[PDB]
Design a protein around this ligand. Structure first.
Ligand SMILES: C=CC(=O)N1CCN2c3nc(OC[C@@H]4C[C@@H](F)CN4C)nc4cc(-c5nc(N)cc(C)c5C(F)(F)F)c(Cl)c(c34)OC[C@@H]2C1
Ligand SMILES: Nc1nc2c(ncn2[C@@H]2O[C@H](COP(=O)(O)OP(=O)(O)O)[C@@H](O)[C@H]2O)c(=O)[nH]1
Ligand SMILES: [Cl-]
Ligand SMILES: [Cl-]
Ligand SMILES: [Cl-]
Ligand SMILES: [Mg+2]
Length: 168
């Protein structure tokens, strides 16, 4: 099987830890420690190929030492996560993409835009608004809901396909 190192980036409280557990453990955690950054592993099948994933749930203080960049440079794909009910988290996407392009030293890094918390009624970030931003980036965009499993597995598998295309 092929290994894929994934990194989940995004502002705080957007659902990175909830999305990560919903894919690994297949259940929703409504209150995970926001200061905890850990790595998870699970082997799934993606369009026939068996894929072993190592997903990094990022958290903690924003810091750009050579050790941190080198550790973040090990990620092959990135999930830039925002909340459809938090405008600021959607404006901070340009920050994470810019920092990912810097440490990876490339302008075509495999990544997928994630609009989490789509199960909530009041939405402030429009769907087509985030869709045109991902179209400008040239990256996929998927709306997910860690509570209802909606698109969770879809968002993660789409990122592995972007890595597959970039590799070949
Ligand atoms: C609860 C809190 C929480 O979970 N949080 C909040 C802090 N938060 C991060 N907030 C920021 O800005 C925040 C604001 C917004 C913008 F205005 C600039 N900042 C003032 N920037 C972060 C940057 C990185 C980071 N660092 C590197 N060395 C290299 C790369 C390639 C990255 C990557 F990949 F991420 F880009 C990482 Cl790992 C972060 C960041 O961890 C995630 C945590 C998640
Ligand atoms: N309604 C709803 N709430 C969510 C969802 N995902 C996360 N949350 C809530 O957002 C809060 C923080 O989520 P968290 O997993 O810590 O995201 P993170 O801080 O960015 O890593 C939690 O109290 C969750 O209840 C979702 O899909 N739907
Ligand atoms: Cl499973
Ligand atoms: Cl950091
Ligand atoms: Cl910098
Ligand atoms: Mg978290």
């Amino acid at each position: 099987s092929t290994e894929y190192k994934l990194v989940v980036v995004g502002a705080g409280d957007v659902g990175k830890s909830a999305l990560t557990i919903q894919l690994i453990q297949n259940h929703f955690v409504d209150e995970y420690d926001p200061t905890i950054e850990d790595s998870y592993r699970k082997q799934v099948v993606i369009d026939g190929e068996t894929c072993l994933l190592d997903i990094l749930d990022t958290a903690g203080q924003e810091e750009y030492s050579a050790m941190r960049d080198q550790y973040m440079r090990t990620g092959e794909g990135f999930l830039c996560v925002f909340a459809i009910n938090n405008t600021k988290s959607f404006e901070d996407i340009h920050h994470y993409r810019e920092q990912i392009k810097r440490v990876k030293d490339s302008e075509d890094v495999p990544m997928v835009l994630v609009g989490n918390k789509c199960d909530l009624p009041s939405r402030t970030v429009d769907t087509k608004q985030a869709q045109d931003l991902a179209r400008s980036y040239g990256i996929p965009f998927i709306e997910t809901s860690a509570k209802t499993r909606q698109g969770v597995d879809d968002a993660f598998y789409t990122l592995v396909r972007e890595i597959r295309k970039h590799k070949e």
